[PDB]
C-alpha cells in the first residue's frame, strides 16, 4: 500500500553515515534491513536494528508495523557474538 | 511531650496512591468514602503499616484479616480520616487526620501540622526471620463444616503454648519459660544488623509426645527476631505468629465455602511487597476456577494497598524462607548471590537490580556448554528474574529451547537449532520477544571505555527497570547486576555475575574467588565493542 | 615527552553543538585558537566548509584577545576541508562529538591532555579614534589600505594611567619593568577587573568620504608579565580592532549598505574564559543587524537560543562606555560571595542582574517597596541578557501598569500600596510580553520540600525568583540541596535596605547570603514567580 | 452557542474543591475568575488563576483564547501582598 520512510544510521562507523529508505508498508522489514546493510557495506547477518531510544527491533514483520511501533529514526548496530 | 509516635508519612502516601491506582478516574466515579486502619509496633509507638480501604471494607471482619496477615510484633494502633468524612471503625488509640491536598501533594509537612504528636521517620527493616514448618489437623462434621472450622481454630490457639521450636545446628530452643528463667539477648548473634528477607533462622516445630470431613493444613509460620530480644520475648511472638496463621487459614477456609469453592486446603506463602519494612503472611487457596483466582489476586492488592502495576502476590514471588517449602526453579540454584557480600564498600553512589534472580553458570543443566554457553547462561539469569518477580511462570528454557526460538522468529536457521553456536545480546532480545512478548533496550558501545562513560545509563536502568543486564563483547558474555559511580571522582565500579562456570552452589567460592564480585572500570576491554541488553518489564499485575 | 597541549574538551564539544543548533549535508571543519606560549587551547571554533577561508580565520582572530592566536586546526573523521596553518591538526570523529566522549578524544589526539581551562588576568582598556579618508569610487580599496598603514603606525602609540603612574609604550628589551601590573592582575578576572588607560600619539607623525571611527581597545594584563609583554599585546590588540573595523566596513560596502560608522563592544559569551572583541555595524537596519548578529553566532560557535551579542549585554569596561542600566548599581552581588561550603548540589542564576533595594532611586520605600525592588532585579536580568532595551521601571511606572490592565484602579498609581508575586507577573506580561510560572505553597515548609522545583527552574530558565509571603518579599538566586541528608539552603538577595552601594557590608550582613530552610515561616503561605525567557536571539 | 469548559481547583482549601464552568467562548475571563471565586466564597481581588502545571493566566482576554493557550485545568490561588 502507501509508503513509510525510515532513516537508518550506522553506529559502528564513527562518521555516523545515515541512509533514507522508503518502502511500501506491506514490505517485510527484513528487506529494508538487508538493503540498508549492503548499502552501508555491512553484513545483514551480523547487524541489528534498534530504535532511536535503544529499543530493539524485530525485522520479521511488515514495515508498517515498525513505523507505528518505533518510528522513522532507526540505528544499525553490530551483532556481538561471544562465547568462550 | 512523651507520647511521640513515629510514622513513615511518605510510605503512607504511596499506599493511598496504590489503592487509588485501581480507579485511575479521580472525581469521575461515584464511590463510598475512604477510611483506613493504622498498624504498627504499639510498644515503641512506631507506625509500620497504614492500610487504606473504601468503606465497605472498613469492617471488623476485614480488620481481623489484615492483622492476622501482618508480622507478630505488629498490631492495630489506630484509624485515619480523610477530609473528616471517612467512616471510623472504633479501635486503636488515635486517628490520623489526613486531607485530600496532603495525599495528592504528598506534603509531609502538612501531615505533621495536623497530626501534632507524630514525627516523620524513614522506617527501615530490622531483625531476622525465624521460620518453622507447622502442621495441624481439623475435623469438620458434614453440614457443619463452616460452624466447626471457626471453633477448631479457637482451641488450637489455646493449645499453641505447649509447642517447642528447636534449631539443631546451633542448639537453639524456644519454649514456654517462667519469666525468671528467661535467657536475655538470646539470638543477638543472628539478629544483629539483619534483614527479614535474607537472614533466616530455621526451627523444627515440636510438640510433647504425651499430649464428617477431615482437613489437614501443613504450612510455614514466620516470626521476627530482633536485637536485644529476650528468650521469653521470642516465645510470646512465636505463639502469636502461629495463632494468626491458624486464624488466617480459618478465615480463608470459611469465606471459601461462602464464595462457592467450599472446603479447600491452603498453601502458605510469605511476601515482602514493594516498599514494606515488615513481611506479609498469607494463606492461599489451592483449588478454584481461574476466575476465582484472578479476582482473589486483585482484591488482595486492594486490601493491602498494593500497586496495580507490578505483580506482587504471585506464588513464585513468595520468599524461600523455609527449606522444605516448595520452590519454582530453585533446583540447586543460588538465589541472589550478590546479596551475600559485605567485602565491598561504595566508592560513590550505587544503584543495583530490583528483584530476585538465579545464578546460571556452566554445565549445571546436565549437558556441558563450555565456552559457547556463556551467552545462553546470562539469558537464563534474566529469565529467572521474570519468574521470581511474577511476570511469568514458564520455566527457564534449555539451550535447545532458546535456539529453536531464533529459528521460529526467523533469525538463525534449523541447523542453528542443533548447534553449539555463539549468540549475543541481540539474539537474547529476540527470544525474550518471542517466548515472553518482551521489549528490550540497548546500550550500544564501540569500546570498553564508552561502557564506563555511559554508566549513568546503567544506573538509570537499575533505578527504573531493575532487570539484570547481560553484556556481550570481546568474545565474552557477562551479567551486570549493579554499578557504583561517583559523579565527582569519575571512579566507576561494576557488579558482575560471571556466567562462566563454577563448581556448584557454594558462595564462599563464588563470593571470594571473584565469580560474583565488584569489578573495576578496567574490566572491559578498550579495544573491543560492547553491547548491553536492558530487558523491560511490562506494567500489569 | 612533555610538549603536552592542554584543552577543555567539554568546552569544545559544546561549541560543536552550538554550531549544530542552527541546522534544520555539507561537511564541517574548524580552527583552533590558543595561547601558543604555554601550549594551551582557549577557543575551538567550528565552521562548515564554506567558511574555512583565510578571509574568515582573520575575522575570528581579530575578534579574540591579543594573546591568543591560531595554534592549529581540526578534522572531523577525515572529510573536512582544512586551511593549512598552525602546528597541529585535531583528529575528531562525528560520533565522539555527538555523544561528547573525552575518552575517544584523548586516544585520537595523544599529545593532548584535558583541563578545565579557567579565566586569567585583568583587562586593560582605553578609548581610541582614527579618521579614514576614502576616495569615492574605490572606497573598499582605500579602507583596506588605510587599515594596513594604521597597523604600521600603531607601534608609536602610548597608553598611560595618570592615577597610579603607569605607562605602556614601545620599549627596548632591557628597559622592561618586570612584574609591572602585578598588584592589579593578581587573582583577577577579565570581565570585572579593569585598568583604564589614556591613548596618546606622538607629534612626530600623521571629492571623498571621511570616516572617523572611535571605539575601545581591550588587552589582557596577566600576572608576572613585563612592560614589554604588555606593550606587544597592546599593539596587537589595536591592530586586530582596526582590522575588525575594516572587515565589517568592507562587508557593509559590498552588501550595498555603503560606508557606515561602527560601535566597539566587548563580550564574554557564555562558557568562555577569554573576551570577545567586536566592531558592530550600528547604522544598519535592525533586521540587517539581526542577520549579522546571527552570523556571528554561527562563526563563533554560540547558542541559537539565547541572545549573546546584543548591545544590552555588552561589558562596560571603559568608564565612557554607554550603559543601559545604572552605573551605581551592583552587578551580580552573589558572585562576590566569600568562602561558602555547599551542603549538597548547587544551582544558581544563569545570567547577570543588578541589586535593587530600598532607598535607592530617591524614593523612601521603608516598608512597601519590597516587591517593587525584587521586580526591578528581575527586569535587570532581562536587560543584561539581551531580552529588552527598555530601562528598569520606577515604582510609579509599575503601579501605572497594574492600573492600565485594570487591576488596581488608579488610586494605586499615586500610592504606597503593597503588591506581590502575582502583580509582578502581570506587569512583566504587559511591558515585555513575558510569561510567568508559579510555585504556590501553603507554608514555608512546602517551599523547602519543593526545592527540586526551584533547582529545575534555575537549571533551565535561570531567571531570578521573587518570593512573597509573611508580608515580606525576597529574591531567590539559588538553592543548595542535598537529596540524601535532606538539608536545603537558599541563596536570598534581600531587597530590604542596603542604602549604600557597598559590597563588603552586603556579604558580612544578612543581605545576599545563604539562608537555611529555617528562614521561611512555617505559619504563612508563600508564592514564587518564575520569569520565563522568550524564544529568539 | 459555542462554549469552552474549565475545571478550577481551589488550592487554599485542603479538600481541593473544584467548580466546573461551561462558559461561552466570548466571555471575558474576568467574569469566570470573579464567579469562580464567588462560589468558593473567597475574594476575587485577593485571588489569581494559574494553570495546572504552573503558568500564570492573564484574565483580561476572552475565555476562548484562554482555553487555547492554557488547558481546561486551572487553579485558583490566593494573592500575596508583601511590602516588607
UniProtKB/Swiss-Prot annotation, chains A, D:
GO terms for biological process: protein ufmylation; response to endoplasmic reticulum stress; reticulophagy. Expressed in the intestine and head neurons. The keyword Electron transport does not apply. PANTHER family: UBIQUITIN-FOLD MODIFIER 1 (PTHR15825:SF0). There is a cross-link at residue 69 (Glycyl lysine isopeptide (Lys-Gly) (interchain with G-Cter in UFM1)). Interacts with odr-8; leading to deufmylation. GO terms for cellular component: cytoplasm; nucleus. The gene is ufm-1. SUPFAM superfamilies: Ubiquitin-like. Ubiquitin-like modifier which can be covalently attached via an isopeptide bond to substrate proteins as a monomer or a lysine-linked polymer. The so-called ufmylation requires the ufm-1-activating E1 enzyme uba-5, the ufm-1-conjugating E2 enzyme ufc-1, and probably the ufm-1-ligase E3 enzyme ufl-1. Belongs to the UFM1 family. This is Ubiquitin-fold modifier 1. Keywords: Isopeptide bond, Ubl conjugation, Ubl conjugation pathway. The keyword Plastid does not apply. It comes from Caenorhabditis elegans. There is a cross-link at residue 83 (Glycyl lysine isopeptide (Gly-Lys) (interchain with K-? in acceptor proteins)). It holds the Pfam family Ufm1. Residues 84 form a propeptide.
UniProtKB/Swiss-Prot annotation, chain C:
GO terms for molecular function: deUFMylase activity. Gene3D superfamilies: 3.90.70.130. One of its GO terms (biological process) is positive regulation of chemotaxis. One of its GO terms (cellular component) is nucleus. Expressed in head and tail neurons. Expressed in the amphid head neurons ADL, ASI, ASH, ASJ, ASG, ADF, ASK, AWA, AWB, AWC, and in two tail neurons, the phasmid tail neurons PHA and PHB. Disulfide bonds: none annotated. Interacts with odr-4. It comes from Caenorhabditis elegans. Thiol protease which recognizes and hydrolyzes the peptide bond at the C-terminal Gly of ufm-1, a ubiquitin-like modifier protein bound to a number of target proteins. Required, with oct-4, for the localization of a subset of 7 transmembrane domain odorant receptors, including odr-10, to the cilia of olfactory neurons AWA and AWC. Operates in aggregation behavior, and responses to oxygen levels. The keyword NADP does not apply. Changing residue 437 to A: Reduced ability to hydrolyze ufm-1 bound to a target protein. The keyword Membrane applies. InterPro entries: Papain-like_cys_pep_sf, UfSP1/2_DUB_cat, UfSP2-like_N, UfSP_MPN. It is found in: Endoplasmic reticulum membrane; Cytoplasm; Cytoplasm, Perinuclear region. Changing residue 527 to A: Strongly reduced ability to hydrolyze ufm-1 bound to a target protein. Belongs to the peptidase C78 family. This is Ufm1-specific protease. Keywords: Chemotaxis, Cytoplasm, Endoplasmic reticulum, Hydrolase, Membrane, Protease, Thiol protease, Ubl conjugation pathway. Its main location: endoplasmic reticulum.
Amino acid at each position: 500500500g502507501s509508503k513509510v520512510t525510515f532513516k537508518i544510521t550506522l553506529t559502528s562507523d564513527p562518521k555516523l553515515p545515515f541512509k533514507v529508505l522508503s518502502v511500501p508498508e506491506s514490505t517485510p522489514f527484513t528487506a529494508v534491513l538487508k538493503f540498508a546493510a549492503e548499502e552501508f557495506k555491512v553484513p545483514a547477518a551480523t547487524s541489528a536494528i534498534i530504535t532511536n531510544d535503544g529499543v530493539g527491533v524485530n525485522p520479521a514483520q511488515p514495515a508498517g508495523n515498525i513505523f507505528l511501533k518505533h518510528g522513522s529514526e532507526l540505528r544499525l548496530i553490530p551483532r556481538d557474538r561471544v562465547g568462550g | 511531650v512523651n507520647e511521640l509516635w513515629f510514622i513513615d508519612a511518605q510510605a503512607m502516601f504511596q499506599n493511598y496512591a496504590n489503592l487509588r491506582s485501581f480507579s485511575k478516574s479521580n472525581a469521575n466515579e461515584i464511590n463510598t468514602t475512604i477510611g483506613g486502619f493504622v498498624f504498627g509496633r504499639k510498644a515503641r509507638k512506631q507506625v509500620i503499616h497504614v492500610l487504606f480501604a473504601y468503606a465497605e471494607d472498613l469492617t471488623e471482619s476485614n480488620r481481623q484479616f489484615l492483622e492476622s496477615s501482618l508480622s507478630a510484633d505488629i498490631e492495630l494502633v489506630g484509624n485515619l480520616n480523610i477530609d473528616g468524612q471517612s467512616q471510623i471503625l472504633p479501635g486503636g488509640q488515635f486517628t490520623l487526620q489526613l486531607t485530600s491536598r496532603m495525599l495528592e501533594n504528598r506534603s509531609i509537612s502538612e501531615f505533621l501540622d495536623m497530626n501534632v504528636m507524630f514525627n516523620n521517620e524513614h522506617v527501615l527493616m530490622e531483625g531476622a526471620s525465624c521460620v518453622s514448618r507447622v502442621g495441624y489437623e481439623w475435623s469438620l462434621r458434614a453440614g457443619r463444616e463452616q460452624e466447626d472450622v471457626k471453633s477448631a481454630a479457637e482451641r488450637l490457639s489455646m493449645a499453641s503454648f505447649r509447642f517447642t521450636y528447636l534449631n539443631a545446628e546451633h542448639g537453639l530452643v524456644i519454649r514456654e519459660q517462667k519469666p525468671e528463667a528467661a535467657q536475655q539477648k538470646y539470638l543477638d548473634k543472628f539478629s544483629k544488623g539483619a534483614v527479614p528477607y535474607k537472614d533466616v533462622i530455621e526451627f523444627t516445630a515440636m510438640q510433647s509426645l504425651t499430649r464428617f470431613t477431615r482437613l489437614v493444613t501443613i504450612g510455614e509460620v514466620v516470626f521476627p527476631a530482633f536485637f536485644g530480644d529476650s528468650s521469653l520475648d521470642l516465645y510470646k511472638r512465636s505463639r502469636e505468629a502461629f495463632n494468626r496463621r491458624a486464624n488466617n487459614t480459618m478465615m480463608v477456609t470459611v469465606n471459601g465455602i461462602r464464595a462457592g469453592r467450599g472446603v479447600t486446603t491452603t498453601t502458605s506463602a510469605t511476601y515482602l511487597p514493594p516498599g514494606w519494612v515488615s513481611l506479609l503472611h498469607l494463606q492461599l487457596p489451592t483449588k478454584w476456577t481461574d476466575n476465582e483466582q484472578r479476582n482473589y489476586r486483585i482484591r488482595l492488592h486492594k486490601l493491602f494497598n498494593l500497586p496495580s502495576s507490578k505483580p506482587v502476590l504471585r506464588l513464585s514471588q513468595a520468599l524461600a524462607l523455609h527449606s522444605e517449602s516448595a520452590r519454582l526453579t530453585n533446583k540447586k540454584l543460588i538465589r541472589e548471590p550478590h546479596l551475600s557480600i559485605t567485602n565491598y564498600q561504595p566508592v560513590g553512589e550505587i544503584t543495583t537490580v530490583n528483584g530476585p534472580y538465579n545464578y546460571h553458570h556452566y554445565m549445571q543443566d546436565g549437558i556441558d556448554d563450555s565456552g559457547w554457553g556463556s551467552a545462553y547462561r546470562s539469558f537464563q539469569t534474566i529469565w529467572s528474574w521474570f519468574i521470581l518477580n511474577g511476570y511469568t511462570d514458564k520455566p527457564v528454557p534449555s539451550h535447545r529451547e532458546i535456539q529453536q526460538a531464533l529459528v521460529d522468529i526467523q533469525d538463525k536457521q534449523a541447523k542453528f537449532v542443533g548447534s553449539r553456536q555463539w549468540i549475543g545480546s541481540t539474539e537474547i532480545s529476540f527470544v525474550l520477544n518471542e517466548l515472553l512478548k518482551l521489549e528490550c533496550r540497548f546500550i550500544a558501545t564501540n569500546s570498553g571505555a564508552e561502557v564506563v562513560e555511559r554508566v549513568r545509563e546503567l544506573a538509570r536502568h537499575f533505578e527504573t527497570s531493575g532487570t539484570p543486564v547481560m553484556i556481550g563483547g570481546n568474545m565474552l558474555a557477562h551479567t551486570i547486576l549493579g554499578v557504583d559511580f561517583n559523579d565527582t571522582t569519575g571512579e566507576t565500579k561494576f557488579l558482575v555475575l560471571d556466567p562462566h562456570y563454577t563448581g556448584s552452589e557454594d558462595i564462599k567460592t563464588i563470593t571470594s574467588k571473584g565469580w560474583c564480585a565488584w569489578k573495576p572500570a578496567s574490566f572491559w576491554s578498550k579495544d573491543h565493542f560492547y553491547n548491553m541488553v536492558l530487558p523491560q518489564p511490562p506494567s500489569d499485575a
